[PDB]
């Protein structure tokens, strides 16, 4: 509800990082609106463990500690002449994000940039690899590929986790739609979240 987006906008104020130089404010504070969907136990968890949210101005790999990113073809990206520079967010053990990429197909597959991106952070900071327990492995064999993408969600269970986590918590929409398709995924979100 309205005031409970608020409340996470307080905790993401000590999460995220604006970047330097200029850039649409505007969607920079629409990015952190949607953050704040997420459930504000998985919020306080990844500030008390330091976890940084940086928005980006410019291209991932132009930060000095994504350098080593330059050049390289992300896992099952070969042969398209695109690669880690041209992804615009990145998740697990730091988060960095492109304003203005959040939506799907803007460089990346997820229905949403900074769901995603934080999912995978919530996964392996926060829940110690959750996506890789026995538990989510099993759910992940029978509903990973459900949500689509079957070559890439359906073969990564840490991908199919950030994804399945970014449609319980963008909208009404996407987490019915997650809901009808993924229905035991969607009950471990639940009780995840419970
Ligand atoms: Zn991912």
Redesign the pocket.
Known sequence: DSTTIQQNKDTLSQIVVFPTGNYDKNEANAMVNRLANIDGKYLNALKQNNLKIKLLSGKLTDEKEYAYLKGVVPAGWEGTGKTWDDVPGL?GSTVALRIGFSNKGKGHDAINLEL??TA?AIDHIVLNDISKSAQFKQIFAKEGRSLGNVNYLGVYPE?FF?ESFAYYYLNQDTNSKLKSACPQTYSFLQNLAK
């Open positions: 998740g995603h991106e995978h991908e950030a």
